[PDB]
Swiss-Prot record, chains A, B, C:
Entry GO terms, CC: icosahedral viral capsid, spike
Assigned keywords, A-Z: Capsid protein, Virion
UniProt source species: Enterobacteria phage PRD1
Protein known as: Spike protein P5
Subunit-level organization: Homotrimer.
Keyword Nucleotidyltransferase: no
Compartments where found: Virion
Length: 144, 144, 144
């Protein structure tokens, strides 16, 4: 029961994020300064590159990244998660009622045992405006 | 193997939902009358407020809410899930082929032991028309 | 710890997919030729119909289907997953930064013990152009 490894982070201008996330561009997030909301095991850890997967941790991972930036209600929020040669994306139309976006994924991750390569990379933006009032949550859990 | 708590519901005009979900607005759903499709354990239960998390159930939760309302193929379906001070959203462009939307999340939930506060709240609508022919499925499972 | 059954596939023109996925239409995918990236247990297997659920495997399933087709950056990527009488959809606006889409679901699956009926069906397209340079990943795991 439960999972062997998991990491949940809260990313904001106050907790490790850029003072302003540029519009219409996807630059991977430095998560070293992110606030750890919950941590399980030691297989998943935050770093300047994203979320590191410890050696020997190949398997299935459930990942979710969400964002709310209530002061930006136009354009589309673009979200992206990368691991190795794979990248996953989604675009979420903004509105006052939905001032943000969400991306969730269940994927298989092969861990080579090379720290700089075995890392989940995260990024998002709004295609029409910079974000400087965002609350981003990133959670990853090894389910097998 | 398996999860300790889970709840899967089917929400419609015949099973607890409003006769008509207003357009372009997000009013949290009363799930007391929702049809229970599957239930595991007793940590997650349906209520007029949404889905209650029993005391002592802090942890990671996988959540999914989907909707199909085939007679509304225009505008954007707006979906929202809330827990405590956090809210998660997504907008899904409608079409005849995709007359609805989907929102899935893996999040950490802190349970304070205050029933009225420890509740997952759900809501959705179409930003251009009311929904009165919808099939909404909401499933939550505690994975850690 | 871990899941009892899971299947992760990589679908492309080189690994079982159509030479060209027609625009604005959703025809279920023949996954018999998909590349198996990871397999756990024997409850979930690829077939010409989609992903078969073995008899006695009723329960909760976490499903994700993603697509990247970098040469198609316009219109909306439409994704759909079906099981029995239920269908789940999402539309994802394309862009150069998000040339694809994502759909993830946690749903309850009742297995009748009728192979042709107990199958997860998958489909996607772009509503404005055919796809002939796609990398589609489909992963399903029985979590309870």
């Amino acid at each position: 029961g439960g999972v062997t490894d998991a990491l949940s982070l809260m990313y904001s201008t106050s907790t490790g994020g850029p003072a302003s996330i540029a519009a219409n561009a996807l630059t991977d997030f430095d998560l070293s300064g992110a606030l750890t909301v919950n941590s399980v095991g030691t297989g998943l850890t935050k770093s300047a590159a994203g979320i590191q997967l410890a050696a020997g941790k190949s398997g299935l991972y459930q990942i979710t990244m969400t964002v709310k930036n209530n002061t930006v209600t136009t354009g589309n929020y673009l979200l992206r998660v990368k691991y190795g040669s794979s990248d996953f994306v989604v675009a979420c139309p903004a509105s006052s009622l939905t001032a943000g976006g969400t991306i969730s994924l269940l994927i298989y991750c092969n861990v080579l045992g090379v720290v700089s390569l075995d890392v989940l990379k995260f990024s998002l933006c709004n295609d029409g405006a910079a974000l400087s009032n965002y609350i981003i949550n990133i959670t990853a859990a090894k389910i097998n």
